[PDB]
Amino acid sequence: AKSSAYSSRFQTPFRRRREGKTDYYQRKRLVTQHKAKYNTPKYRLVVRFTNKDIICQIISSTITGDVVLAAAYSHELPRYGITHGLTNWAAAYATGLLIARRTLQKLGLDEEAVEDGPRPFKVFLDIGLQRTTTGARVFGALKGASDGGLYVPHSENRFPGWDFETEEIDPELLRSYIFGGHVSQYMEELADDDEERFSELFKGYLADDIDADSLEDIYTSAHEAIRADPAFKPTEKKFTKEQYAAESKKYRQTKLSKEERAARVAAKIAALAGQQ
Amino acid sequence: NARAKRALVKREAKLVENVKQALFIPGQSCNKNLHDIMVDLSALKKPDMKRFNRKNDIHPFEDMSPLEFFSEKNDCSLMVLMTSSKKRKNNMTFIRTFGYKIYDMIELMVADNFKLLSDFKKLTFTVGLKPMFTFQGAAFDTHPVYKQIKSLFLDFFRGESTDLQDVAGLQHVISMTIQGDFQDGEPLPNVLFRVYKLKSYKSDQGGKRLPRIELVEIGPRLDFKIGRIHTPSPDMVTEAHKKPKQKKNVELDIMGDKLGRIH
Amino acid sequence: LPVTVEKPIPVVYDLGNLAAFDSNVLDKNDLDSSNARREEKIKSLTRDNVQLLINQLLSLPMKTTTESVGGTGGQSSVMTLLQLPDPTTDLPREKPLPKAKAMTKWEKFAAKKGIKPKERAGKMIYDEASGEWVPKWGYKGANKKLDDQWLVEVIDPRTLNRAERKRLVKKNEKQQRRNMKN
Amino acid sequence: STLIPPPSKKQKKEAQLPREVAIIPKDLPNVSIKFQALDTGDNALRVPGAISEKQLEELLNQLNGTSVPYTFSCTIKASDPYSSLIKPQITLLYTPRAVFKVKPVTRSSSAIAGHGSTILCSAFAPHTSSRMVTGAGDNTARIWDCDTQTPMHTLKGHYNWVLCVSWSPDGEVIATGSMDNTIRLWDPKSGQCLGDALRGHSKWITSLSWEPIHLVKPGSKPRLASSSKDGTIKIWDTVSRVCQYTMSGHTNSVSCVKWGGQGLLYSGSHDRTVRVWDINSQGRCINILKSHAHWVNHLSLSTDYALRIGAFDHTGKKPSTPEEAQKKALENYEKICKKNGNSEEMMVTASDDYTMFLWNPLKSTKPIARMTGHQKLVNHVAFSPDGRYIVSASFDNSIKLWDGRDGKFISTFRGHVASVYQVAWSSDCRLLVSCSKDTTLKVWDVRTRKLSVDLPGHKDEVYTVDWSVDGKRVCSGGKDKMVRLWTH
Amino acid sequence: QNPMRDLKIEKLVLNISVGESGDRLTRASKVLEQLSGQTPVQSKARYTVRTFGIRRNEKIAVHVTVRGPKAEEILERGLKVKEYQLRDRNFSATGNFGFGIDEHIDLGIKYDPSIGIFGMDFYVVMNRPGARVTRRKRCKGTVGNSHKTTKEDTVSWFKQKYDADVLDK
RNA sequence: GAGAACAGAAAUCUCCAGUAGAACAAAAGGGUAAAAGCCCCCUUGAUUUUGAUUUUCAGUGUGAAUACAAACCAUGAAAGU
RNA sequence: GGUUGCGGCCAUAUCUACCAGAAAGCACCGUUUCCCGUCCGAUCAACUGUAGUUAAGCUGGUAAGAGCCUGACCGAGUAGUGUAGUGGGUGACCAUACGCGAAACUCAGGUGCUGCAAUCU
């Protein structure tokens, strides 16, 4: 029960805020950075997590709406040899390490800028709507391109193994989460005790005969493989675009014309007015 | 108790003044097409730009008083009104002020050969950079209309003042030309207004240093027709041109070193 | 692929506002509205304007710091940025110059008797009993010790101490106005 | 803070004028040019237009018919390499590039926790820069996975300060010299105490050097040189882990040791004296050197960076057969050995008589040059990785630069505030890192004689820095118990 | 058709409104402590009423919210005293509902003459799977109408198990 | 508005909602919404250092105030503020 | 064409009322050892992609719904006012003129388009 006078008075927010996706307030700082010092182009590292997927992009800032310099996906990882735990802590480091080696190759510093020249490269990090909790896997994406070489300036507080009462960080516990040892630990925590849930979980490892000690060897082997080839081979694109087009158009309900709805208007007053 | 005070400090007069604020206002006679010129003109004035949601019946060369009633509120020295009519079609009224008092105004009818940014072969752009400025014609410097127009968009688009600048920010340029030469007695021609984004080329005859610059249209392709003009009082002009004011036989060397010349 | 472009009129540079001023003859019918051959007449002049601009821009000195990690308000060492001159074209100033000066009637009295201004050192006095510092006003101020302590040593007296400050606080507020008038 | 004095009101008007496009207009005079290789050869007299050097490189590369790019230098008084032609026939001085670029180090990784004591020494593997061992004030050593910046095999087993370490230049074995008497050999992959500790010195270990790759037979591991504070020098086996001999030559503590190029050994000691030792005489002294008036610190050899890396390039590609490695280390040494077609490796001695002497010990017993100029004592002296420039580090907060040929003074890298502790080179012979007693590190272009970028970031003094062979990463060690990896 | 959208319990609200702060307030928390196991939470006084004799910011009520089957354990033993019988009103239009009793010792709890006798506020909220879309931070949305709950589904569900009764329609 | 025993016009608890009759330090044409509202977390402030206005009897390379700017400082993972 | 992220304009994008939605991608959904966080694994964290579900979200479609947008000579050069004549008028204010100059009202139509990147029968 809401009045029609209110139906004129309310102000629609932005669709991108009406969808629960973007804070412009946070984005507003990411537009008006300093900027009274210099004109330096701002680059934005956007990281997003859906379920069963990891998206990481370097995104520019464009009046047209944006331009994306590079993109990295969690489903690019079976190209490099990871089959399960695609959304874990470790794949975020694998995602973060990937996109840096990838974007350096198109940058081409290995493998207009006059008067020196080389110019190392910085991107600032988008947070998104994710809660800033320490040890969370979002900052695992920060860890990768850092080791990849992208200078995203930051601090180490949200890294896992950050002590509370003293400002100390554990590199040793950090090493386990990079190689996913806690998973392979909790594999072994569930293998000996309560096999029934362990029957449910880890089933692809049970399908592939993959044990706990192998898991640490999986990533580390796969790391330099990424460092060998980050070069973004995109898909073979089966069923080319018109084949995707018409099949969706077989499930695609259309509006009616005014010439139809006038017959639908005239269907009412003959039925709902002229005494049944 | 204290939050608002900083806003009042932002409204303070100041020796080194801030970047002047533009204000985009839809007038009463507004349509879709003039509305989208606003947005594609807004892109150069990102971030410092505000809009309304309302039609606003203001006749500027009739009365000026509600304009300050906006301007003193939103602390915007520069104001843009939207108006199209039978006589004065597509008139984008531009206002410079002085201490929330109207310094001057200008009517600017827009021609119909315009392009929006979607009309262009779509290129990139980086939001909120300083452009470069090119004025082709001596009549910008001589003729008092175009001196004022030169006085307008320099004080409209430049944004931040600096002593120091990265190469990487130099992406785009704004080009303004008067439509051919004319005479005092020939009608004031239209405004050839184009915008490019640059492109480097290692050209090998400038050697290690100098590139070859070959532009691409990005737009928006626009043509302005001049209407009438309000002008400031000369006493106001002197106030709007004043230094903040902030030694013989006395020199600093390198390393300080206040010296005294004898003669 | 050649770079250097001449013009009939020496184009004035204003590098402080990053500006370029061609003053040459603008041919009319080249700039005809219905002329299809227009954009090249626009662009070729413009890119020859721009090419000359950067040649002055690249004729400038530049900064090379040697700082590094956590460059708080500066450039990197790999950054090398253009030392600009001043904007010579005198644009209209937005707001008049704020000179709100008075003698405030104290400075007059400071002018006659040469009471120099004090050091403006700090808030903290030293207390005896206890041996702490406990600054003068702001928290546990030396002012409001009398109203909080527990005896009197000869109608309440402590609210009178509140009252006499409310004279002297408002005496600032009364002396605020008259110097705001004059 | 202190500030630069500002530009003047006069000077502000000066910059307002439009000025100075470097047109290089036609640019048509024509002056003749002479080429000269900087080792021995002068080659002819030609006259093109005023051009860029990329054409000049392709002018010289067809003259020999190379397909090897070169560096060009000229106007030599005052040493100023159309770029030269604005300064005033003309003699061009050319020299090879060893074409590779190492990017200057600006930022870091994180600071790395670990052992709770000071850091004494560190070294990269030559085959990859992801692995790097550190010597600690703790009883243990530490190997780091530099990619993850995480510990790989916290390495227990000594029971005193692990003073000096080294990597086996093929990439197999790690030596760990300790403050008690002990040397343990190590495997990087396993992190296990490879047999018993090498025992037999009676005082602490001073310096450890490996027998180089291109001398050891194919099918044999390289041996080790050991110098210790009791004056003894013992040449150990790795296989049987029993030393071959002591040598009782020097009197005081032996400062440093290097294996020679022509199968020789070199020993600076605290007897103000350097001895020349030969393995093929079963460890027998052959030449004694008497120049210094105070005792000798940190001798180095010309070709040592080649002798350190052991048949890896900057890419670090692993060779297959031991004979191929016998070729490759020989190849890489020969590229630096015979600059003048001559196997004349050079040696410079450094000591606390504020003096360095230039030596050709095989050819003569007379020193070539007496380097002089420091005020406090020199500490750390190393050649350039092409074996061409000699740098000198000292306690007078200054880093002086010398020629490698005649011992001529070049310049001084002023800018350090406290005593310079040690320096290290970039692989492409351009950059130069240095650690000093102050917190910062400073990286120096040898070509422009200038601070590239000062880098702070530690918390305290810095004892050890080292440069990665690929030119990628930089490890650091000091008192503040943290490891900091520095890179581009 | 409920392929997933069955009708489990969200949580039990245990609540005790004590008009004063003090030992009558703190024991009421200790009543909730020994019952719920968790630490309860204290509602402050919103404004000044003074007809109850109460002013603003007085830490008036204590309450605690329990979820899971642990709630359902506690939920039965009040219905034990309520004898598996609830009345008409006693139900939201949404289908959220509750009741209450005095004498908290009627279920489990020993008398404990040093803790006194309180009465409790019982309340149960209901949900179907999918309610996170109204509860999650990112992409916050609104539940469709067919997926929503009524009193009518709530009563038919509530008679069904717990052996319960309608008690005047 | 629909709900929950004691509990009533007013005690707390659930759901629907108020374009907000959120309180906005202000007063307002207007707008802030993952807030400038509410709550929680972390912390000084009257720091130093020199070119513009002053005042000096040890005229006192400033001795201090005052004006400006810079270094710093606080927090935030960061952008930043 | 569908979808997904980052977006631009920010109602033609909303609200209300129904219905439909292959594929894929989302989502709901599985879990509580670790990291993290709550009165509460509800939220947030982690984990899993296994056990399930397209039911909601979402995406279209439907409603002479509410609102909202454009075009038109829609009022309309109207109101109004500038200016112009020793006009008329006891006043208040009215014929001629030539300058600006509007809205409400009516008709015509509507009901998000778009940027980048990636992917699906």
Coordinates of all heavy atoms in Angstrom, one line a residue, chain D residues 175-229:
Chain D
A175 N 78.7 -25.1 1.3 CA 79.6 -25.0 2.4 C 79.1 -24.1 3.4 O 78.4 -23.1 3.1 CB 81.0 -24.5 1.9
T176 N 79.3 -24.4 4.7 CA 79.0 -23.5 5.8 C 80.1 -23.4 6.8 O 80.4 -24.3 7.5 CB 77.7 -24.1 6.5 OG1 77.9 -25.5 6.8 CG2 76.5 -23.9 5.7
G177 N 80.8 -22.3 6.7 CA 81.9 -22.1 7.7 C 81.3 -21.5 9.0 O 80.4 -20.7 9.0
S178 N 81.8 -22.1 10.1 CA 81.3 -21.8 11.4 C 82.3 -21.1 12.3 O 83.5 -21.3 12.0 CB 80.7 -23.0 12.1 OG 80.4 -22.6 13.4
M179 N 81.8 -20.5 13.3 CA 82.7 -19.7 14.2 C 83.4 -20.7 15.2 O 84.4 -20.2 15.8 CB 81.8 -18.7 15.0 CG 82.3 -17.8 16.0 SD 83.7 -16.8 15.5 CE 84.4 -16.4 17.1
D180 N 83.0 -21.9 15.3 CA 83.8 -22.7 16.2 C 85.0 -23.3 15.5 O 86.1 -22.7 15.6 CB 82.9 -23.8 16.7 CG 82.0 -24.5 15.6 OD1 82.3 -24.3 14.5 OD2 81.1 -25.3 16.0
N181 N 84.9 -24.3 14.7 CA 86.0 -24.8 13.8 C 85.4 -25.4 12.5 O 86.2 -25.8 11.6 CB 86.8 -25.8 14.4 CG 87.8 -25.2 15.4 OD1 88.4 -24.2 15.1 ND2 88.0 -25.8 16.5
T182 N 84.1 -25.5 12.4 CA 83.4 -26.6 11.7 C 82.9 -26.1 10.3 O 82.5 -25.0 10.1 CB 82.3 -27.2 12.5 OG1 81.4 -26.1 12.8 CG2 82.9 -27.7 13.8
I183 N 83.0 -27.0 9.3 CA 82.4 -26.9 8.0 C 81.6 -28.1 7.7 O 82.0 -29.2 7.7 CB 83.5 -26.7 6.9 CG1 84.3 -25.5 7.1 CG2 82.9 -26.7 5.6 CD1 85.5 -25.4 6.2
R184 N 80.3 -27.8 7.4 CA 79.4 -28.9 7.0 C 79.0 -28.7 5.6 O 78.8 -27.5 5.1 CB 78.2 -28.9 7.9 CG 78.5 -29.2 9.4 CD 77.4 -29.2 10.3 NE 77.9 -29.3 11.7 CZ 78.2 -30.5 12.2 NH1 78.1 -31.6 11.6 NH2 78.7 -30.5 13.5
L185 N 78.9 -29.8 4.8 CA 78.4 -29.7 3.5 C 77.0 -30.0 3.4 O 76.5 -30.8 4.3 CB 79.2 -30.6 2.6 CG 80.7 -30.1 2.5 CD1 81.4 -31.0 1.5 CD2 80.7 -28.6 2.0
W186 N 76.3 -29.5 2.4 CA 74.8 -29.5 2.4 C 74.3 -29.8 1.0 O 74.9 -29.4 0.0 CB 74.3 -28.2 2.9 CG 74.7 -27.9 4.3 CD1 75.8 -27.1 4.7 CD2 74.2 -28.4 5.4 NE1 75.9 -27.1 6.0 CE2 74.9 -27.9 6.5 CE3 73.1 -29.3 5.7 CZ2 74.6 -28.2 7.8 CZ3 72.8 -29.6 7.0 CH2 73.5 -29.1 8.0
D187 N 73.1 -30.3 1.0 CA 72.4 -30.5 -0.2 C 71.2 -29.5 -0.2 O 70.4 -29.5 0.8 CB 71.9 -31.9 -0.4 CG 71.0 -32.0 -1.6 OD1 71.5 -32.0 -2.7 OD2 69.8 -32.1 -1.4
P188 N 70.9 -28.8 -1.3 CA 69.8 -27.8 -1.3 C 68.5 -28.5 -1.3 O 67.5 -28.1 -0.6 CB 70.0 -27.1 -2.6 CG 71.4 -27.3 -3.0 CD 71.7 -28.7 -2.5
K189 N 68.4 -29.7 -2.0 CA 67.1 -30.3 -2.1 C 66.7 -31.0 -0.8 O 65.6 -31.1 -0.4 CB 67.1 -31.3 -3.3 CG 65.8 -31.9 -3.6 CD 66.0 -32.8 -4.8 CE 65.6 -32.1 -6.1 NZ 66.7 -31.2 -6.6
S190 N 67.7 -31.7 -0.2 CA 67.4 -32.5 1.0 C 67.6 -31.7 2.3 O 66.8 -31.9 3.3 CB 68.3 -33.7 1.1 OG 69.6 -33.3 1.4
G191 N 68.6 -30.8 2.3 CA 68.8 -30.1 3.6 C 69.4 -30.9 4.7 O 69.0 -30.8 5.8
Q192 N 70.3 -31.9 4.3 CA 70.8 -32.8 5.2 C 72.3 -32.6 5.4 O 73.0 -32.2 4.5 CB 70.5 -34.2 4.8 CG 69.0 -34.5 4.5 CD 68.2 -34.1 5.8 OE1 67.5 -33.2 5.8 NE2 68.3 -35.0 6.8
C193 N 72.7 -32.9 6.6 CA 74.2 -32.8 7.0 C 74.9 -33.9 6.2 O 74.9 -35.0 6.6 CB 74.3 -32.9 8.5 SG 76.0 -32.7 9.0
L194 N 75.6 -33.5 5.2 CA 76.2 -34.4 4.3 C 77.4 -35.0 4.9 O 78.5 -34.5 4.6 CB 76.4 -33.8 2.9 CG 76.7 -34.8 1.8 CD1 75.6 -35.7 1.6 CD2 77.0 -34.0 0.5
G195 N 77.3 -36.0 5.7 CA 78.4 -36.6 6.3 C 78.8 -35.9 7.6 O 78.1 -35.0 8.1
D196 N 80.0 -36.2 8.1 CA 80.5 -35.5 9.2 C 81.0 -34.1 8.8 O 81.4 -33.9 7.6 CB 81.7 -36.3 9.8 CG 82.1 -35.7 11.2 OD1 81.5 -34.8 11.7 OD2 83.1 -36.3 11.8
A197 N 81.0 -33.2 9.8 CA 81.6 -31.9 9.6 C 83.1 -32.0 9.3 O 83.8 -32.8 9.8 CB 81.4 -31.0 10.8
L198 N 83.5 -31.1 8.4 CA 84.9 -31.1 8.0 C 85.7 -30.4 9.1 O 85.6 -29.2 9.3 CB 85.0 -30.3 6.7 CG 84.9 -31.2 5.4 CD1 83.6 -31.9 5.2 CD2 85.1 -30.2 4.3
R199 N 86.4 -31.2 9.8 CA 87.1 -30.7 11.0 C 88.6 -30.8 10.9 O 89.1 -31.7 10.2 CB 86.6 -31.5 12.2 CG 85.1 -31.3 12.5 CD 84.7 -32.1 13.7 NE 84.5 -33.5 13.3 CZ 85.3 -34.5 13.7 NH1 86.3 -34.3 14.5 NH2 85.0 -35.8 13.3
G200 N 89.3 -29.8 11.5 CA 90.7 -29.8 11.3 C 91.3 -28.4 11.4 O 92.5 -28.3 11.6
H201 N 90.6 -27.4 11.1 CA 91.1 -26.1 11.5 C 91.0 -25.9 13.0 O 90.1 -26.5 13.6 CB 90.3 -25.0 10.8 CG 90.7 -24.9 9.3 ND1 91.9 -24.4 8.9 CD2 90.0 -25.1 8.2 CE1 91.9 -24.4 7.6 NE2 90.8 -24.9 7.1
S202 N 91.9 -25.1 13.6 CA 91.9 -25.0 15.0 C 91.3 -23.6 15.4 O 91.0 -23.5 16.6 CB 93.3 -25.1 15.6 OG 94.1 -24.0 15.1
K203 N 91.1 -22.7 14.5 CA 90.3 -21.5 14.8 C 89.2 -21.4 13.8 O 88.9 -22.3 13.0 CB 91.2 -20.3 14.8 CG 92.1 -20.3 16.0 CD 93.0 -19.1 16.2 CE 93.9 -19.3 17.4 NZ 93.1 -19.4 18.6
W204 N 88.5 -20.2 13.9 CA 87.3 -20.1 13.1 C 87.5 -20.0 11.6 O 88.6 -19.5 11.2 CB 86.4 -19.0 13.6 CG 87.0 -17.7 13.5 CD1 87.1 -16.9 12.4 CD2 87.5 -16.9 14.6 NE1 87.7 -15.7 12.8 CE2 88.0 -15.7 14.1 CE3 87.6 -17.2 16.0 CZ2 88.5 -14.8 15.0 CZ3 88.2 -16.3 16.8 CH2 88.7 -15.1 16.3
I205 N 86.5 -20.3 10.9 CA 86.6 -20.2 9.4 C 86.6 -18.8 9.0 O 85.8 -18.0 9.5 CB 85.4 -21.0 8.8 CG1 85.3 -22.4 9.4 CG2 85.5 -21.1 7.3 CD1 86.5 -23.2 9.1
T206 N 87.5 -18.4 8.1 CA 87.4 -17.1 7.5 C 86.7 -17.0 6.2 O 85.8 -16.3 6.0 CB 88.8 -16.5 7.4 OG1 89.6 -17.2 6.4 CG2 89.6 -16.6 8.7
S207 N 87.2 -17.8 5.2 CA 86.6 -17.7 3.9 C 86.6 -19.0 3.2 O 87.5 -19.8 3.4 CB 87.4 -16.6 3.1 OG 88.7 -17.0 2.9
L208 N 85.7 -19.2 2.3 CA 85.5 -20.5 1.6 C 85.4 -20.2 0.1 O 84.6 -19.3 -0.3 CB 84.2 -21.2 2.1 CG 84.3 -21.5 3.5 CD1 83.0 -22.1 4.0 CD2 85.4 -22.5 3.8
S209 N 86.1 -20.9 -0.7 CA 86.1 -20.8 -2.1 C 86.1 -22.2 -2.7 O 86.6 -23.1 -2.2 CB 87.3 -20.0 -2.6 OG 87.2 -20.0 -4.1
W210 N 85.5 -22.3 -3.9 CA 85.4 -23.5 -4.6 C 86.4 -23.7 -5.7 O 86.9 -22.7 -6.2 CB 84.0 -23.7 -5.2 CG 83.0 -23.9 -4.2 CD1 82.2 -22.9 -3.6 CD2 82.5 -25.1 -3.7 NE1 81.3 -23.5 -2.8 CE2 81.5 -24.9 -2.8 CE3 82.9 -26.4 -4.0 CZ2 80.8 -25.9 -2.1 CZ3 82.2 -27.4 -3.3 CH2 81.2 -27.1 -2.4
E211 N 86.8 -24.9 -6.0 CA 87.6 -25.2 -7.1 C 86.7 -25.0 -8.3 O 85.6 -25.6 -8.4 CB 88.2 -26.6 -7.0 CG 89.3 -26.8 -7.9 CD 89.9 -28.1 -7.8 OE1 89.4 -29.0 -7.1 OE2 91.0 -28.4 -8.4
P212 N 87.1 -24.3 -9.3 CA 86.2 -23.9 -10.4 C 85.9 -25.1 -11.3 O 86.5 -26.1 -11.4 CB 87.0 -22.8 -11.2 CG 88.4 -23.1 -10.9 CD 88.4 -23.6 -9.5
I213 N 84.8 -24.9 -12.1 CA 84.2 -25.9 -12.9 C 85.1 -26.4 -14.0 O 85.4 -27.6 -14.2 CB 82.8 -25.5 -13.5 CG1 81.9 -25.2 -12.3 CG2 82.3 -26.5 -14.4 CD1 81.6 -26.4 -11.5
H214 N 85.8 -25.4 -14.7 CA 86.5 -25.7 -15.9 C 87.8 -26.4 -15.6 O 88.6 -26.6 -16.5 CB 86.7 -24.5 -16.7 CG 87.6 -23.5 -16.1 ND1 89.0 -23.5 -16.3 CD2 87.4 -22.5 -15.2 CE1 89.5 -22.5 -15.6 NE2 88.6 -21.9 -15.0
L215 N 88.1 -26.7 -14.4 CA 89.4 -27.4 -14.1 C 89.1 -28.8 -13.6 O 89.9 -29.7 -13.8 CB 90.2 -26.6 -13.1 CG 90.6 -25.3 -13.6 CD1 91.3 -24.5 -12.6 CD2 91.4 -25.4 -14.9
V216 N 87.9 -29.1 -13.0 CA 87.6 -30.4 -12.4 C 87.3 -31.3 -13.6 O 86.6 -30.9 -14.6 CB 86.5 -30.3 -11.4 CG1 86.2 -31.6 -10.8 CG2 86.9 -29.3 -10.4
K217 N 87.8 -32.6 -13.5 CA 87.5 -33.5 -14.5 C 86.1 -33.9 -14.7 O 85.3 -33.9 -13.7 CB 88.4 -34.8 -14.2 CG 89.8 -34.5 -14.3 CD 90.6 -35.8 -14.0 CE 92.1 -35.6 -14.0 NZ 92.9 -36.8 -13.7
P218 N 85.6 -34.3 -15.9 CA 84.2 -34.7 -16.0 C 84.0 -36.1 -15.4 O 84.6 -37.1 -15.8 CB 84.1 -34.8 -17.5 CG 85.4 -34.9 -18.1 CD 86.3 -34.1 -17.2
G219 N 83.1 -36.1 -14.4 CA 82.9 -37.3 -13.6 C 83.5 -37.1 -12.2 O 83.8 -38.1 -11.6
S220 N 83.6 -35.9 -11.8 CA 84.2 -35.6 -10.5 C 83.6 -34.3 -9.9 O 83.4 -33.3 -10.7 CB 85.7 -35.5 -10.6 OG 86.3 -36.7 -11.0
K221 N 83.3 -34.3 -8.7 CA 82.8 -33.1 -8.0 C 84.0 -32.2 -7.7 O 85.1 -32.6 -7.6 CB 82.1 -33.5 -6.7 CG 80.9 -34.3 -7.0 CD 80.2 -34.7 -5.7 CE 79.0 -35.6 -6.0 NZ 78.4 -36.0 -4.7
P222 N 83.7 -30.9 -7.7 CA 84.8 -29.9 -7.4 C 85.2 -29.9 -5.9 O 84.4 -30.3 -5.1 CB 84.2 -28.6 -7.8 CG 82.8 -28.7 -7.6 CD 82.5 -30.2 -8.0
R223 N 86.5 -29.6 -5.7 CA 87.0 -29.6 -4.3 C 86.8 -28.2 -3.7 O 86.2 -27.3 -4.4 CB 88.4 -30.0 -4.3 CG 88.7 -31.4 -4.8 CD 90.1 -31.6 -5.0 NE 90.7 -30.9 -6.1 CZ 92.0 -30.9 -6.4 NH1 92.8 -31.6 -5.7 NH2 92.4 -30.2 -7.4
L224 N 87.2 -28.0 -2.5 CA 87.0 -26.8 -1.8 C 88.2 -26.2 -1.2 O 89.1 -26.9 -0.8 CB 86.0 -27.1 -0.7 CG 85.4 -25.9 0.1 CD1 84.5 -25.2 -0.9 CD2 84.7 -26.3 1.3
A225 N 88.3 -24.9 -1.2 CA 89.4 -24.2 -0.6 C 88.8 -23.7 0.8 O 87.6 -23.2 0.8 CB 89.9 -23.0 -1.4
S226 N 89.6 -23.7 1.8 CA 89.2 -23.3 3.1 C 90.3 -22.5 3.7 O 91.5 -22.9 3.7 CB 88.9 -24.5 4.0 OG 90.1 -25.2 4.3
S227 N 90.0 -21.3 4.2 CA 90.9 -20.4 4.9 C 90.4 -20.2 6.3 O 89.2 -19.7 6.5 CB 91.1 -19.1 4.2 OG 89.9 -18.4 4.3
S228 N 91.2 -20.3 7.3 CA 90.8 -20.1 8.7 C 91.7 -19.3 9.5 O 92.9 -19.0 9.1 CB 90.6 -21.4 9.4 OG 90.3 -21.2 10.8
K229 N 91.3 -18.8 10.6 CA 91.9 -17.7 11.4 C 93.2 -18.2 12.1 O 94.0 -17.4 12.5 CB 90.9 -17.2 12.4 CG 91.3 -15.9 13.1 CD 91.8 -16.1 14.4 CE 92.1 -14.7 15.1 NZ 93.1 -14.0 14.4

